[PDB]
Amino acid sequence: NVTVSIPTILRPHTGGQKSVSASGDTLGAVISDLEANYSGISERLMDPSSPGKLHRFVNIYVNDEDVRFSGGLATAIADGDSVTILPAVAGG
Amino acid sequence: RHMTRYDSLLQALGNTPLVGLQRLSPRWDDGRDGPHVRLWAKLEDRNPTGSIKDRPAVRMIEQAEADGLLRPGATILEPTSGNTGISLAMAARLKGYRLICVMPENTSVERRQLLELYGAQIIFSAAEGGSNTAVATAKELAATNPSWVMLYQYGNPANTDSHYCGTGPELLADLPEITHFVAGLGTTGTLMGTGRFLREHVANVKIVAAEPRYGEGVYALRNMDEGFVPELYDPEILTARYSVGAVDAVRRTRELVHTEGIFAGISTGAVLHAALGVGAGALAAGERADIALVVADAGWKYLSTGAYAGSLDDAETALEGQLWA
Amino acid sequence: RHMTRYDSLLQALGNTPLVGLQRLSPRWDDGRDGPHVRLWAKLEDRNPTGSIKDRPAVRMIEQAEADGLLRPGATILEPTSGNTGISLAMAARLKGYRLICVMPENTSVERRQLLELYGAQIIFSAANTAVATAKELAATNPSWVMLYQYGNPANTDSHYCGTGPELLADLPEITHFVAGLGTTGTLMGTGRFLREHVANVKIVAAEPRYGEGVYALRNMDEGFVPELYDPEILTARYSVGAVDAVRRTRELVHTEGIFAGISTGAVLHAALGVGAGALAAGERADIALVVADAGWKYLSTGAYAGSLDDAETALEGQLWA
Ligand SMILES: *Cc1c(COP(=O)(O)O)cnc(C)c1O
Numbered sequence: 001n002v003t004v005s006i007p008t009i010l011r012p013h014t015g016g017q018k019s020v021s022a023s024g025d026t027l028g029a030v031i032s033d034l035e036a037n038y039s040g041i042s043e044r045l046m047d048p049s050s051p052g053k054l055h056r057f058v059n060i061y062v063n064d065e066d067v068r069f070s071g072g073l074a075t076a077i078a079d080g081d082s083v084t085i086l087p088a089v090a091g092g
Numbered sequence: 093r094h095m096t097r098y099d100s101l102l103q104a105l106g107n108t109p110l111v112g113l114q115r116l117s118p119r120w121d122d123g124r125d126g127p128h129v130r131l132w133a134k135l136e137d138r139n140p141t142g143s144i145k146d147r148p149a150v151r152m153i154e155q156a157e158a159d160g161l162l163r164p165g166a167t168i169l170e171p172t173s174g175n176t177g178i179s180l181a182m183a184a185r186l187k188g189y190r191l192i193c194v195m196p197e198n199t200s201v202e203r204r205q206l207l208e209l210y211g212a213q214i215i216f217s218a219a220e221g222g223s224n225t226a227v228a229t230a231k232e233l234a235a236t237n238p239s240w241v242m243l244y245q246y247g248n249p250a251n252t253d254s255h256y257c258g259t260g261p262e263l264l265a266d267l268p269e270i271t272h273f274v275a276g277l278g279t280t281g282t283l284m285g286t287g288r289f290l291r292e293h294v295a296n297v298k299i300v301a302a303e304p305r306y307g308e309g310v311y312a313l314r315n316m317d318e319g320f321v322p323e324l325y326d327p328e329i330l331t332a333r334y335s336v337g338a339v340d341a342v343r344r345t346r347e348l349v350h351t352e353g354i355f356a357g358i359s360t361g362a363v364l365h366a367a368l369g370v371g372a373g374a375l376a377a378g379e380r381a382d383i384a385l386v387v388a389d390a391g392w393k394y395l396s397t398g399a400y401a402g403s404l405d406d407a408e409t410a411l412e413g414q415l416w417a
Numbered sequence: 418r419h420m421t422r423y424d425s426l427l428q429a430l431g432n433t434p435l436v437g438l439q440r441l442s443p444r445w446d447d448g449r450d451g452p453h454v455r456l457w458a459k460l461e462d463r464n465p466t467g468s469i470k471d472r473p474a475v476r477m478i479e480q481a482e483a484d485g486l487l488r489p490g491a492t493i494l495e496p497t498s499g500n501t502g503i504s505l506a507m508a509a510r511l512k513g514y515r516l517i518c519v520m521p522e523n524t525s526v527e528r529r530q531l532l533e534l535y536g537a538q539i540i541f542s543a544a545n546t547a548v549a550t551a552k553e554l555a556a557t558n559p560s561w562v563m564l565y566q567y568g569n570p571a572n573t574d575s576h577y578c579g580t581g582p583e584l585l586a587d588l589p590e591i592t593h594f595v596a597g598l599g600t601t602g603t604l605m606g607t608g609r610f611l612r613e614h615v616a617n618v619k620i621v622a623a624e625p626r627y628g629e630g631v632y633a634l635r636n637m638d639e640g641f642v643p644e645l646y647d648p649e650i651l652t653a654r655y656s657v658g659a660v661d662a663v664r665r666t667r668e669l670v671h672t673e674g675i676f677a678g679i680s681t682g683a684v685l686h687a688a689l690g691v692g693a694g695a696l697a698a699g700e701r702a703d704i705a706l707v708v709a710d711a712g713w714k715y716l717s718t719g720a721y722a723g724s725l726d727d728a729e730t731a732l733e734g735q736l737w738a
Pocket residue numbers: 143145175176276277278279280281282283357359360388389416417
């Protein structure tokens with residue numbers, strides 16, 4: 001089980017909740033689990049033109065580390081990890 | 093380099109000190125338990141206006157002057173989160189240019205005090221979207237007023253050039269043993285120019301970004317398409333990228349001044365947090381490391397935020413609505 | 418010292434830049450109308466904690482170590498809330514000492530908070546009363562060390578051995594040295610060194626006529642500061658009001674880009690007086706002036722109000738060191 005921080009822009013998918021539980025042993029597994037509980041959320045994370053890749057303007061971090069440098073959706077996830085989702089804002 | 097008398101403040105730009113952090117380093121000397129893992133702080137607050145941004149601001153202005161874009165009485169327009177605008181305000185005051193900065197409203201009061209002192213106009217942009225909103229507002233104004241000069245730090249290769257020709261060479265001259273470079277990530281100029289220089293000149297060097305994580309409101313765009321990645325950015329230069337929240341950044345900023353006597357801005361605390369992670373990794377692996385990290389500015393412009401007083405929790409509440417790099 | 422990499426912050430002490438003021442100088446270029454009259458700013462805000470006090474604070478500690486007065490983990494006690502307090506706090510921290518600072522209870526929260534961030538513990542006194550409280554605490558407490566910056570020889574020695582030699586190395590052509598007048602260490606130490614090495618050099622004091630006036634009474638009394646009243650040691654002294662200091666610090670930031678602390682307005686006012694004199698006299702001058710700290714700590718004090726009148730009121734109601 002992991003704790004996922006949901007940015008304001010995606011909270012209409014999570015009933016307004018800013019933080020939700022998810023399970024999975026990779027980022028892709030957590031995204032799958034999120035989709036099971038929060039319909040439509042995964043499509044918002046993924047590139048509509050390059051399926052299988054994250055949206056250019058979405059950043060995701062597992063225990064504060066950017067998944068683009070740790071295997072992307074294959075990034076390993078362990079029980080107790082934090083997952084942070086943020087839109088791309090210069091300086092943030 | 094190696095000079096102490098200069099004919100003007102702008103001539104003294106750069107050539108900043110590199111200072112070892114003997115107490116914070118995971119291991120200062122080689123021991124029976126394995127090789128050293130040293131942190132070295134590059135003090136970019138020892139620049140004309142007190143931040144690293146003096147380097148790209150001077151380079152951008154001088155490139156534009158060389159290009160013939162800037163002549164006496166010209167108007168410069170720039171979106172900024174404070175430091176670039178302060179550096180440009182100083183250079184514009186001395187060179188006789190007018191400066192209009194577009195800056196998010198949730199920036200520290202010290203930034204607007206300095207901009208007003210140097211005679212720059214400030215256009216405050218809304219806090220939601222952070223620098224994305226200031227950039228969008230500036231681009232609209234530039235398009236409407238084509239005679240103004242928008243140097244545009246998020247796309248102008250003179251930003252990166254300033255680091256490829258300044259920060260990078262100076263670091264390598266002082267630290268030929270360098271294994272890692274850690275810095276913040278805003279325009280991406282520091283890591284793209286310093287990191288390209290280092291990757292080209294130093295076998296096996298690793299380049300690490302330490303990105304602030306702001307409160308939720310900063311990221312509250314209305315559409316994912318309002319997202320923005322600076323045109324300077326090339327993810328191939330980085331080895332890793334860390335997102336550091338306010339409590340960790342504030343903790344490490346306080347640790348740095350308590351332990352090493354260096355009074356740095358909050359982005360430095362995010363850098364230090366990343367660098368200590370990288371350091372812990374090298375120590376666990378029994379690998380020698382010499383990790384240089386940027387102190388982009390001093391603590392002075394953040395004193396009004398409250399973050400340097402009170403309990404470590406609540407510095408967090410103090411910074412929730414605010415930008416801090 | 419022409420060095421760029423240092424194994425600790427303390428090793429980066431001093432060796433501060435000297436920067437020409439080509440616009441504020443009465444005449445930067447020699448030419449048909451006569452010789453140059455140049456101002457050169459010695460940027461002491463480049464020190465570890467952002468003021469000149471890092472020099473005497475380090476030296477006072479190192480001398481007390483040498484004299485066996487300071488042993489590992491000792492407590493230093495200091496009746497200061499300003500730049501020396503901050504410098505001693507940094508230095509005590511890096512060397513392993515505790516620092517206790519005594520200050521009036523009506524000291525600004527910002528001054529108090531800066532001291533605490535560097536590690537000082539504060540004892541408040543009733544709003545020279547702080548020195549008196551520090552003294553009772555010296556009595557009641559077990560080999561706490563007071564260093565006393567006003568009579569302290571290590572304060573002047575830090576400038577005799579640091580500031581003076583650096584100025585001569587960078588500016589062998591120096592004709593005048595201008596600095597503020599607080600503990601007197603800067604002028605006494607740097608002035609002695611320059612007078613020993615530069616024939617006919619002139620030493621000029623800039624004394625703020627604003628602020629608390631911690632050492633102002635002291636500095637009026639030849640029993641305390643006899644050298645200040647010898648014309649062969651101190652050529653002249655400018656007494657500078659707040660309105661002139663405020664105008665000069667604005668002029669410096671607008672003309673040269675240098676964002677100086679409030680004492681520097683007095684220093685620049687004196688240095689401009691000295692420069693106007695040399696220009697009218699047809700003399701070559703190379704005038705070094707101290708920027709003892711930057712504007713940063715004064716941003717919360719009202720010193721940058723729009724109204725020079727309100728800025729005046731602010732400088733009168735605060736400490737400049
Ligand atoms: C600009 C800035 C950064 C980020 O540097 P970039 O070169 O723009 O990526 C980090 N910290 C501070 C204080 C800054 O002003």
